[PDB]
Design a protein around this ligand. Structure first.
Ligand SMILES: CCCCCCCCO
Ligand SMILES: CCCCCCCCO
Ligand SMILES: CCCCCCCCO
Ligand SMILES: CCCCCCCCO
Lengths: 198, 198
């Protein structure tokens, strides 16, 4: 469908050039459609970006729910390591999508806040699953639930920052590093498990 | 001295308004000196910012070296927790300086890179002290020196990001939270110690 081709082109072009410098015309020629056809489907550039962004994050969210159904009984450290492994695999296999998602930090303030608010409406869910899994554990002395959860969420939140800093626009480098990043994530989560639990 | 008054005014105004929106004229009236007197001492706004920034980081660096002379025999987790405690104390007592330092992320690219390079010329030192202290320890199974060091440096590097996100421009809130942040840093470093070592 033409709408899907436009969305796919938008992911590619926004991810290569950034929000500000990408144009709807570039997206339209990349999708192989007429320049006005963007505006048939999408009110403007902002809504094009937003719909692309929501399209990608929805697909990801469905994958996370499938994974969650299948790994819910693992302890949280194992669960999180496995999910991070999946995101690392997704990023190496869909570099343009990953490059697309990280352009959010340089989107216009109004659109960016709008999207950051939408994303919180799944992050506060995961956050709560983490909190619940934490109650299943016998926590080490002085390790409160609030500290365990802060620290784990800060660890998890650092995925995007590493990506932006090191792998954005470098698909070959991430492919080269993928298995080693997985190996390091496992050790770091084992460090946190051993330190947080009795 | 007039130069010191200008530098102090620059810290205050750059920290309140940001690099881009601050003017030398604002700085000059804040310092109580003539508008041209800035340019007697400082070639331009960029050099004014740079000299202010180097003035603050130098003072901090001297404090870090004093601390290092006095705490070098502590293990690294204790050493780092104590240094973080000092920076938290410095930030609560010098909010305007802390607000000043965090404006670096929104400085013009050329000046920002220049300063980020200068700061690396002390961060690579601390980094190496951390590496050396790590060799004194018996590391836990699979915890390599490179992983221990990556993880600890990422932990330590998160100070500035929390500040920017939560305490920039909110001196009362940081004062309110200071002792609790210290208490949480201690537990987090104890988590890392227990997990990283045998
Ligand atoms: C900067 C090296 C350590 C970053 C670990 C990233 C956490 C994975 O979510
Ligand atoms: C694509 C980058 C995210 C993975 C972060 C894991 C870093 C551990 O060294
Ligand atoms: C976002 C809550 C955890 C941040 C811990 C910050 C590390 C202190 O350098
Ligand atoms: C001024 C903010 C830096 C302190 C970060 C410690 C966060 C632990 O909750």
């Amino acid at each position: 469908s033409k709408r899907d081709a436009i969305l796919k082109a938008a992911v590619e072009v926004f991810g290569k050039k950034g929000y500000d410098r990408a144009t709807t015309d570039e997206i339209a020629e990349k999708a192989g459609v007429a320049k006005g056809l963007i505006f048939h489907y999408f009110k403007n550039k902002e809504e094009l970006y937003y719909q692309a962004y929501m399209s990608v994050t929805e697909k990801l969210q469905k994958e996370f729910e499938n994974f969650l159904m299948k790994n819910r009984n693992r302890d949280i450290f194992d669960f999180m390591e496995r999910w991070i492994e999946k995101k690392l695999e997704y990023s190496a296999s869909h570099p343009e999508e990953a490059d697309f998602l990280i352009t959010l930090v340089s989107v216009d303030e109004g659109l960016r806040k709008r999207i950051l608010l939408d994303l919180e409406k799944s992050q506060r869910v995961f956050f709560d699953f983490v909190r619940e899994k934490l109650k299943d554990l016998d926590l080490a002395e002085d390790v409160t639930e609030e500290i365990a959860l802060k620290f784990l969420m800060w660890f998890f939140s650092g995925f995007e920052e590493v990506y932006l800093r090191t792998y954005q626009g470098k698909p070959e480098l991430l492919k080269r590093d993928m298995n080693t990043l997985v190996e390091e994530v496992k050790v770091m989560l084992r460090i946190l498990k051993k330190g947080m639990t009795k």
